[PDB]
């Protein structure tokens, strides 16, 4: 074997402790770069002028933040969607002031995670598996794209991408609610059905399987020792689990087919989260939540408020307060 | 028109209230629209010179049709609700409007995404089927069973 | 792929019970606190620094300005028994909006 | 910053006490006859 051939054999080897692969060849440097920059920035970055109004926001630990308040702050509104790599700055001090770390991190990350998905395909293929685990991972991945890239594209600025921090995340959510009424959007609602439903079905499946474990141990040892890695027989009695659940609701509401059941476990949260991502990605182009402000009107024409109008008042509070120094004209149009 | 000297008007942040510089120095509109300085349109271009928006042209050469057009466009911004209530999210019902640009953009993002999903699905399946394990693992020939342990 | 994996199916399924059940239980505890307005509303160190230094800004302080907006603008209609009348001039607002 | 002066020891003991509990149980499991 020649050198290129041996290299290829190693890269695609099924015997590496962590699989590399061709997707991994891109994933590994990109994820390291984003990770290293993110750690250094989170600890030590100076304040960043996120909204381009010379009003720097401190994100790092050494500059007065804790774990909860800290963030890597989005790049400047003065930059917009312009590509701002280190070499576009006159100096690192400039790069830092304008929020360069944010772009470096999110671009390397989105590429790397795209490659993580590809890699899930690739290893599935090397191992003789079916290929669709990657499709499942498309759901959280699309969501990251929505908040780090699609929303900025639609709004015309990376300054409106989600901040890389906990409180910054909450800021993004509140502003999003003010500007798109996301709660009243059916795609976000499907998202909630997807995650609540996922948690529900996770608990459900956990509890049913656990309830039907076959006796293989004594009381003074963990029931977990009754299963051994790679044994051929199923470790619980599915007919009993179904006997229980079908009687809890009714027979035809319970799954008796394990394959069908696990398919459902995959599909429900994955589809729901696909819609969550699409909610963000379409509100990116300002097609917003349902608006019923003053929809109900009496015989004279007095407005009769509904819960939608109370939501509207809350949204107004958020709207009039956000970025208190950045607007000079009466309409916030992005 | 009220008498403001818009070139010298300093806004609250210290940046020009109406006019400021892009990161490369071109004269642009101020406020949040600083992000949109790459925009170009026939109603705006007559006000543009070599260094960007030109103060003399602004002071002297803005035509009523430009004012009309800018009003029209400002008040048909592509913002609106799913039930086609025009304006920001907090706007009251009255105007029945969602921009065609929004309908087209959103529809095609949804479709493009699901089509990427479909690509992954059918590409992965095509690989598995061509290799012969799209229906599952052969119990008598499970590849992992003939591989060395990872540790 | 990920470096670690399940090897024990019984543990896997128990964990599937444990995770969402424990999460919901924790949320419940926090709500009991909110019953008493015993909130995690502030970081005191943040507020001391911010009150003394008008250039110090974090996402935490930004979120509080949003909350203040919510309270003032939603209260009169949301809490009608208080008969709130907030004159326009006292309403908190940034520039222009 | 004017942080709470008990936060450091609160955090240290919060980590140390249960971690040490787990380490003790782990090592004595290992030393049991194989």
């Amino acid at each position: 074997a020649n050198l290129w051939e041996r290299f290829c054999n190693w890269v695609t080897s099924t015997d590496n402790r962590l699989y590399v692969g061709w997707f991994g060849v891109i994933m590994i440097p990109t994820l390291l770069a984003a990770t290293i920059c993110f750690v250094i920035a989170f600890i030590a970055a100076p304040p960043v002028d996120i909204d381009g109004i010379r009003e720097p926001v401190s994100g790092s630990l050494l500059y007065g933040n804790n774990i909860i308040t800290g963030a890597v702050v989005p790049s400047s509104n003065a930059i917009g969607l312009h590509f701002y790599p280190i070499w576009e700055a006159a100096s690192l001090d400039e790069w830092l002031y304008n929020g360069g770390p944010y772009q470096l991190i999110i671009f390397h990350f989105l590429l790397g995670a795209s490659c993580y998905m590809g890699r899930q395909w690739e290893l599935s293929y090397r191992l003789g598996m079916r290929p669709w685990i990657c499709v499942a991972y498309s759901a959280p991945l699309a969501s990251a794209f929505a908040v780090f890239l699609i929303y900025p594209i639609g709004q015309g600025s990376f300054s409106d991408g989600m901040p890389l921090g906990i409180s910054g995340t909450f800021n993004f959510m509140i502003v999003f609610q003010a500007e798109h009424n996301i709660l009243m959007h059916p795609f976000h609602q499907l998202g909630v059905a997807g995650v609540f439903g996922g948690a529900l079905f996770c608990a459900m499946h956990g509890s049913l399987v656990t309830s039907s474990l076959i006796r293989e141990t004594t009381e003074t040892e963990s029931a977990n020792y009754g299963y051994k890695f790679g044994q051929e027989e199923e470790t619980y009695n599915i007919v009993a689990a179904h006997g229980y659940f079908g009687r809890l609701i009714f027979q035809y509401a319970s799954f008796n087919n394990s394959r069908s059941l696990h398919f459902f476990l995959a599909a429900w949260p994955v589809v729901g989260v696909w819609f969550a991502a699409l909610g963000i990605s379409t509100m990116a182009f300002n097609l917003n939540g349902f608006n019923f402000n003053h929809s109900v009107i009496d015989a004279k024409g007095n407005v009769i408020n509904t819960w939608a109008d109370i939501i509207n008042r809350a949204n107004l509070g958020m709207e009039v307060m956000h970025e208190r120094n950045a607007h000079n004209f009466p309409l916030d149009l992005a | 028109k009220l008498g403001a000297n818009v070139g010298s008007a300093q806004g609250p942040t210290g940046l020009g209230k109406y006019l400021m510089r892009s990161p490369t120095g071109e004269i642009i509109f101020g406020g949040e629209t600083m992000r949109f300085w790459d925009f170009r349109g026939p109603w705006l271009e007559p006000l543009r010179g070599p260094n960007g928006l030109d103060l003399n042209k602004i002071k002297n050469d803005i035509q009523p049709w430009q004012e009309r057009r800018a009003a029209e466009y400002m008040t048909h911004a592509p913002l609106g609700s799913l039930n086609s209530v025009g304006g920001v999210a907090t706007e009251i019902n009255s105007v029945n409007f969602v921009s065609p640009r929004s309908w087209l953009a959103t529809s095609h993002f949804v479709l493009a995404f699901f089509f990427l999903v479909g690509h992954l699905w059918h590409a992965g399946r095509a690989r598995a089927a061509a290799a012969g394990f799209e229906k599952g693992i052969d119990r008598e020939s499970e590849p992992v069973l003939s591989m060395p342990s990872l540790d | 792929i990920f470096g670690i994996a399940f090897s024990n199916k019984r543990w896997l399924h128990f964990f599937m019970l444990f995770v969402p059940v424990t999460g919901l239980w924790m949320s419940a505890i926090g709500v009991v606190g909110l019953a008493l307005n015993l909130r995690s509303y502030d970081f005191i160190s943040q507020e001391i620094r911010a009150a003394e230094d008008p250039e110090f800004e974090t996402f935490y302080t930004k979120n509080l300005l949003l909350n203040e907006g919510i309270r003032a603008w939603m209260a009169p209609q949301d809490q009608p028994h208080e008969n709130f009348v907030f004159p326009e001039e006292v309403l908190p607002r940034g520039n222009a909006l | 910053m004017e942080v709470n002066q008990l936060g450091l020891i609160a955090t240290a003991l919060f980590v140390l006490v249960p971690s040490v509990f787990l380490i003790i149980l782990y090592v004595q499991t290992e030393s049991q006859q194989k």
């Binding site: 402790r17 804790n66 890695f229 | - | 470096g3 | -």
Partner: peptide, 30 residues
């Protein structure tokens, strides 16, 4: 002192990732 604490906990976590992956008890087919 705070920053040291946060960074220290984080560092312990990364170390833990290292041990949990590379020095795990190997899964054995019985």
């Amino acid at each position: 002192m705070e920053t040291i604490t946060y960074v220290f906990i984080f560092a312990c976590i990364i170390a833990l990732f290292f041990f949990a992956i590379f020095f795990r008890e190997p899964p054995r087919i019985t």
